[PDB]
Design an enzyme around this catalytic site. Structure first.
Site, PDB file in Angstrom:
ATOM      1  N   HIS A 142       0.895  -1.216   0.000  1.00 30.74           N
ATOM      2  CA  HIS A 142       0.000   0.000   0.000  1.00 30.74           C
ATOM      3  C   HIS A 142       0.909   1.235   0.000  1.00 30.74           C
ATOM      4  O   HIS A 142       0.724   2.226  -0.737  1.00 30.74           O
ATOM      5  CB  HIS A 142      -0.978  -0.155   1.191  1.00 30.74           C
ATOM      6  CG  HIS A 142      -1.818   1.061   1.446  1.00 30.74           C
ATOM      7  ND1 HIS A 142      -3.216   1.075   1.235  1.00 30.74           N
ATOM      8  CD2 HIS A 142      -1.430   2.295   1.851  1.00 30.74           C
ATOM      9  CE1 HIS A 142      -3.615   2.324   1.478  1.00 30.74           C
ATOM     10  NE2 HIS A 142      -2.583   3.091   1.877  1.00 30.74           N
ATOM     11  N   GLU A 143       1.917   1.189   0.916  1.00 35.69           N
ATOM     12  CA  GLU A 143       2.936   2.221   1.173  1.00 35.69           C
ATOM     13  C   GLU A 143       3.755   2.645  -0.074  1.00 35.69           C
ATOM     14  O   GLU A 143       3.846   3.815  -0.562  1.00 35.69           O
ATOM     15  CB  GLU A 143       3.756   1.976   2.490  1.00 35.69           C
ATOM     16  CG  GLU A 143       2.910   2.075   3.836  1.00 35.69           C
ATOM     17  CD  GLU A 143       1.800   3.098   3.894  1.00 35.69           C
ATOM     18  OE1 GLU A 143       1.782   4.204   3.369  1.00 35.69           O
ATOM     19  OE2 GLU A 143       0.887   2.720   4.675  1.00 35.69           O
ATOM     20  N   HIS A 146       1.991   4.227  -2.782  1.00 35.56           N
ATOM     21  CA  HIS A 146       1.800   5.704  -2.725  1.00 35.56           C
ATOM     22  C   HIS A 146       2.987   6.393  -3.449  1.00 35.56           C
ATOM     23  O   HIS A 146       2.793   7.491  -4.016  1.00 35.56           O
ATOM     24  CB  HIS A 146       1.844   6.134  -1.223  1.00 35.56           C
ATOM     25  CG  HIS A 146       0.507   6.075  -0.519  1.00 35.56           C
ATOM     26  ND1 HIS A 146      -0.653   6.665  -1.090  1.00 35.56           N
ATOM     27  CD2 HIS A 146       0.176   5.498   0.648  1.00 35.56           C
ATOM     28  CE1 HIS A 146      -1.661   6.476  -0.260  1.00 35.56           C
ATOM     29  NE2 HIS A 146      -1.180   5.763   0.758  1.00 35.56           N
ATOM     30  N   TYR A 157      -3.830  14.569  -2.193  1.00 41.10           N
ATOM     31  CA  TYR A 157      -4.403  13.802  -1.106  1.00 41.10           C
ATOM     32  C   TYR A 157      -5.568  14.452  -0.398  1.00 41.10           C
ATOM     33  O   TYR A 157      -5.567  14.728   0.786  1.00 41.10           O
ATOM     34  CB  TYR A 157      -3.286  13.416  -0.135  1.00 41.10           C
ATOM     35  CG  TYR A 157      -3.500  12.108   0.562  1.00 41.10           C
ATOM     36  CD1 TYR A 157      -3.632  12.117   1.945  1.00 41.10           C
ATOM     37  CD2 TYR A 157      -3.554  10.874  -0.093  1.00 41.10           C
ATOM     38  CE1 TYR A 157      -3.755  10.936   2.687  1.00 41.10           C
ATOM     39  CE2 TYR A 157      -3.667   9.668   0.616  1.00 41.10           C
ATOM     40  CZ  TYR A 157      -3.790   9.716   2.017  1.00 41.10           C
ATOM     41  OH  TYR A 157      -3.882   8.594   2.741  1.00 41.10           O
ATOM     42  N   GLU A 166      -5.894   6.559  -2.291  1.00 41.21           N
ATOM     43  CA  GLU A 166      -6.044   5.487  -1.257  1.00 41.21           C
ATOM     44  C   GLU A 166      -6.480   4.128  -1.862  1.00 41.21           C
ATOM     45  O   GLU A 166      -5.914   3.104  -1.566  1.00 41.21           O
ATOM     46  CB  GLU A 166      -7.035   5.988  -0.124  1.00 41.21           C
ATOM     47  CG  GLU A 166      -6.320   6.831   0.943  1.00 41.21           C
ATOM     48  CD  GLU A 166      -5.181   6.007   1.462  1.00 41.21           C
ATOM     49  OE1 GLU A 166      -4.113   6.503   1.482  1.00 41.21           O
ATOM     50  OE2 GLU A 166      -5.419   4.757   1.879  1.00 41.21           O
ATOM     51  N   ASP A 226     -10.368  13.467   7.853  1.00 40.15           N
ATOM     52  CA  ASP A 226      -9.541  12.549   7.070  1.00 40.15           C
ATOM     53  C   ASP A 226      -9.343  13.040   5.685  1.00 40.15           C
ATOM     54  O   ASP A 226      -9.509  12.344   4.693  1.00 40.15           O
ATOM     55  CB  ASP A 226     -10.236  11.192   7.049  1.00 40.15           C
ATOM     56  CG  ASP A 226      -9.436  10.197   6.297  1.00 40.15           C
ATOM     57  OD1 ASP A 226      -8.240  10.100   6.327  1.00 40.15           O
ATOM     58  OD2 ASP A 226     -10.170   9.337   5.726  1.00 40.15           O
ATOM     59  N   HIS A 231      -9.717   7.912   3.320  1.00 37.61           N
ATOM     60  CA  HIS A 231      -9.714   6.528   3.751  1.00 37.61           C
ATOM     61  C   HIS A 231     -11.169   5.942   3.907  1.00 37.61           C
ATOM     62  O   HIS A 231     -11.340   4.759   4.221  1.00 37.61           O
ATOM     63  CB  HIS A 231      -8.970   6.192   5.096  1.00 37.61           C
ATOM     64  CG  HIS A 231      -7.539   6.542   5.067  1.00 37.61           C
ATOM     65  ND1 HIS A 231      -7.089   7.822   5.405  1.00 37.61           N
ATOM     66  CD2 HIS A 231      -6.487   5.783   4.700  1.00 37.61           C
ATOM     67  CE1 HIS A 231      -5.762   7.796   5.239  1.00 37.61           C
ATOM     68  NE2 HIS A 231      -5.380   6.567   4.881  1.00 37.61           N
TER      69      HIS A 231
END
Ligand SMILES: CC(C)C[C@H](NP(=O)(O)O)C(N)=O
Ligand SMILES: [Ca+2]
Ligand SMILES: [Ca+2]
Ligand SMILES: [Ca+2]
Ligand SMILES: [Ca+2]
Ligand SMILES: [Zn+2]
Length: 316
Positions: A142-143, A146, A157, A166, A226, A231
């Site tokens: 996932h990291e 990005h 974002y 996301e 958020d 998310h």
């Protein structure tokens, strides 16, 4: 570090034994010279100062509990590099073999992992809400994804483009989990989330509503937290991706599944060729349809399944 490439062995967060690529120069370092310009893992020593110290070990054996999160962050970053190269022919996150860096043991009881614009950072969790975050391959991917997005579409974002950002990271983190065949599923963070409760996860792609996230555009979060729900609203896109791959009837709309591989191919193409910083959901729909058209032809079933999936979640 300049030294001799070798291979060490260690135990990950889950208690699993694995071989990792190291470099020897007095000490054995968590530096893998076999992939692009290297994969480097650092010790942040419970501090917030980054990156910390390149990880050094005396004997090339990483069986101490403090070693676990560095072993997994280093090995899973290798798997993710491999998935990108082998499957999409992309060399590292920038497409030019950029060194991949990760820091573990960041802060104290930090319940998160993130990409800081330049490296990956992993908390050890507080022991109840999470165990050290690098123990989940979908978390690691996932990291890294990005970074990928940051170098391609550049999705801002916040709001719609941020929830797309996301979704992409959740989609490719799940594809990388299936690619490694590591007990794969359509859930996110299950391997590291709430060590005391079984069967749950942080998010669900198969059923975002299970945890309260929207599975239809009509239920989109319009607020402010958020970053405008990045998310939260990502659940609308996750569900769409899960339907294209797997198929199903959602809110009365039927989708024939085209499978995982095609799902990754059409998303990767949308990501790298048609999406922009400010793309919204309706723009992602157009980009995905155009990618599937490029790849399979306008009259393909592939194109048909993409339209159905987005109509099922209320996007367009
Ligand atoms: C996948 C999750 C463990 C961590 C992730 N961190 P982010 O700042 O990269 O979005 C999250 N909050 O979903
Ligand atoms: Ca050791
Ligand atoms: Ca899994
Ligand atoms: Ca998972
Ligand atoms: Ca759990
Ligand atoms: Zn994220």
């Amino acid at each position: 570090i300049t030294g001799t490439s070798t291979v060490g062995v260690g135990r990950g967060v889950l208690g699993d034994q694995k071989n990792i690529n190291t470099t020897y120069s007095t000490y054995y370092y968590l530096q893998d010279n076999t992939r692009g310009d290297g994969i480097f893992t650092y010790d942040a020593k419970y501090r917030t100062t980054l990156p910390g110290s390149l990880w050094a070990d005396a004997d090339n054996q990483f069986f101490a509990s403090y070693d676990a999160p560095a072993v997994d962050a280093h090995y899973y970053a290798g798997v993710t590099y491999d998935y990108y190269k082998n499957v999409h022919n992309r060399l590292s996150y920038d497409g030019n073999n950029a060194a991949i860096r990760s820091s573990v043991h960041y802060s104290q009881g930090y319940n998160n992992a993130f990409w800081n614009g330049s490296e990956m950072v992993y908390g050890d969790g507080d022991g109840q809400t999470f165990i050290p975050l690098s123990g989940g391959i979908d978390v690691v991917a996932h990291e890294l994804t990005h970074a990928v997005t940051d170098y391609t579409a550049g999705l801002i974002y916040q709001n719609e483009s941020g929830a797309i950002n996301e979704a992409i990271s959740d989609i490719f983190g799940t594809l990388v989990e299936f690619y490694a065949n590591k007990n794969p599923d359509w859930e996110i963070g299950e391997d590291v989330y709430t060590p005391g409760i079984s069967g749950d996860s942080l998010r669900s792609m198969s059923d975002p509503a299970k945890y309260g996230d929207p599975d239809h555009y009509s239920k989109r979060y319009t607020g402010t937290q958020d970053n405008g729900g990045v998310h939260i609203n990502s659940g609308i896109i996750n569900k769409a991706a899960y339907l294209i791959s797997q198929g199903g009837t959602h809110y009365g709309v039927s989708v024939v599944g085209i499978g995982r591989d095609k799902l990754g191919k059409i998303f990767y193409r949308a990501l790298t060729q048609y999406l922009t910083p400010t793309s919204n959901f309706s723009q992602l729909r157009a980009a995905a349809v155009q990618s599937a058209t490029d790849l399979y032809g306008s009259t393909s079933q592939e194109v048909a399944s993409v339209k159905q999936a987005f109509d099922a979640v209320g996007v367009k």
